[PDB]
Design a protein around this ligand. Sequence first.
Ligand SMILES: O=C(O)CNC(=O)c1ncc(-c2cccc(Cl)c2)cc1O
Ligand SMILES: O=C(O)CNC(=O)c1ncc(-c2cccc(Cl)c2)cc1O
Ligand SMILES: [Zn+2]
Ligand SMILES: [Zn+2]
Lengths: 339, 339
Amino acid sequence: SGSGEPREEAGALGPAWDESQLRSYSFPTRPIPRLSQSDPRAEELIENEEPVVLTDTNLVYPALKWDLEYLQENIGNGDFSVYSASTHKFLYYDEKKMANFQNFKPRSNREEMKFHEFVEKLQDIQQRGGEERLYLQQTLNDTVGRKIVMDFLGFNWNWINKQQGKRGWGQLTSNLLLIGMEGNVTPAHYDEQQNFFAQIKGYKRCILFPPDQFECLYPYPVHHPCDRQSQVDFDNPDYERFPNFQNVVGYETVVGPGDVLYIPMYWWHHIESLLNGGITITVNFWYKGAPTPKRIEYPLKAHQKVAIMRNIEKMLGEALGNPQEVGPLLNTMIKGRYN
Amino acid sequence: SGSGEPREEAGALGPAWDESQLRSYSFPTRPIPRLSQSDPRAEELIENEEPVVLTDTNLVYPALKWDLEYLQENIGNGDFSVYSASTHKFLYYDEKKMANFQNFKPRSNREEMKFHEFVEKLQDIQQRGGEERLYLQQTLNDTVGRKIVMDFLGFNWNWINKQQGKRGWGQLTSNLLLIGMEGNVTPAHYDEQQNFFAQIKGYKRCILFPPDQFECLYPYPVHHPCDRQSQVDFDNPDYERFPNFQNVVGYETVVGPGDVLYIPMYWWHHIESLLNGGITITVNFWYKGAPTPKRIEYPLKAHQKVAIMRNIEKMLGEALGNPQEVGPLLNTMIKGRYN
Ligand SMILES: O=C(O)CNC(=O)c1ncc(-c2cccc(Cl)c2)cc1O
Ligand SMILES: O=C(O)CNC(=O)c1ncc(-c2cccc(Cl)c2)cc1O
Ligand SMILES: [Zn+2]
Ligand SMILES: [Zn+2]
């Protein structure tokens, strides 16, 4: 199944999307549940750190009127990070780690520009039917214009603050605004914080994998610039290098305006703006996970084993004085001894 | 080369041993230098933590008269640990770690007995030409008889205490008495302390490998009872499991009465009592290595990387709550990511 039958928009406006707008992949999926925020099952899913789509939170209700016109006239004159790409895949590159791998070629290039400059490129590209793609990813702070501040104040802080308290999460670390073009793909990766993914404009297909599928998704080394992302090309998986990708099973859903997807900490997510669906707008909310208990029940959670692996890789990097010696030492430790 | 031409005993007594008494192995070797304790080159070798045979230390001069008769009549009535074996290989088993591996079969069995009982078995075995083998390995403390205490006090403590101070080593941790039968083999292993190997009776072939040949020698897992020993059977090496054993290069020498072999910390050693050479007697001295400097020069020593690997394996054992999960997690961390 996976995404399921497309939903019918109110007023008999027809289906919001069709299967032809979803890309084709090699793995099966099951659907993420779409529930009401008042449904106790949704409460149980979040508490158990499983994904759920909430349909009626009103989390970003005032932002549902947002489009390029409204934002350009009200966002203000500030710098917005804009990422470029020659293809549909926007692989992230941590610039601080580029020193560790010298012969690493970045595929996407970040650019700072005012918002009207961002709209111009989209208009310019659209005019000449170019194959270039863009993706705006900028934090929203107090600098933005007055009208956008009013909208932000109109978010449902009552609800999201309640969730913060119920789950004992830490503080809201950041709120990121995402504006992308149709067809854009953010490849599979995991984050170390709890995420509420608030869709505003357009539709996004979200494919999630639990932390226990670490073995099938082959993240980059911790010291690599692409740390936390899968090495597997979902469009052309190299089964000789990544054989357990043939065993991957995902959770998917299509989110539209007004939906909020809970992406639990350490869960992989692969996100694409539907083909031929126009631009997409999203706001993300990240919260630090709850602290680790004093006494651990044992039979450790998958995310706890991922955290251990990350720490091993980090400690060796420092202890050996060079991140490039991590791989050779780990292989020495394993070959003919644990494998 | 390796052992080199056998030495000529004084008084034209002929060669002390011949090549026919050495076992045959698949790897090459170079000779350990035999030097005088007054030779500054020997001082440089110890300081640089490289093996050397010292010919004239008088370290255990009073013990050179030791044999089974003398010891039985003077050692006293105490318990001596005696290890048994069905073959010539005496693989060590840490009894405290046997819990971690349940389906582990021990090949040697320890036995407590008085010294005259130990001589009786050697006499009994010799009588019936049995294939069983024995090895006495007991610490020497103040309980032993008066004459043996006098001999121990007659060791060259002036010299060995000077070495302790020069190298900044820690305290003498223990002194072990080793009495074995001809043909006995102590398989390749490394220790975490500095060792002075004082040969008393008979001849032993010592084959040493530097710490940087860790990759070729495939030690057991840290939590295995045979921790610190090589998995490779030197008599029948399994090159499919242990391919880099085909690249091993060793340092060897034959030690006789009055020789002292410095075995540096973390150096592998394989030790065999020569075939048809009678019983062998040895006393070992272990000293804690010097402390780790505050500021490390970097480009780390091979023994420092071994220590890191040991600590990783130990930390994971505790962190995961089960030593048997160490291997699976390490493979998960490496497969398709670092290998
Ligand atoms: O939502 C999408 O459509 C795709 N984007 C992400 O998934 C994402 N994930 C994480 C981050 C991020 C960036 C910086 C810090 C932190 Cl804690 C998180 C940004 C991100 O854009
Ligand atoms: O010398 C031989 O002929 C073979 N024996 C060893 O190599 C040896 N090595 C280490 C120990 C040992 C046993 C207990 C504690 C410590 Cl620190 C060391 C005993 C040992 O017997
Ligand atoms: Zn993310
Ligand atoms: Zn030893």
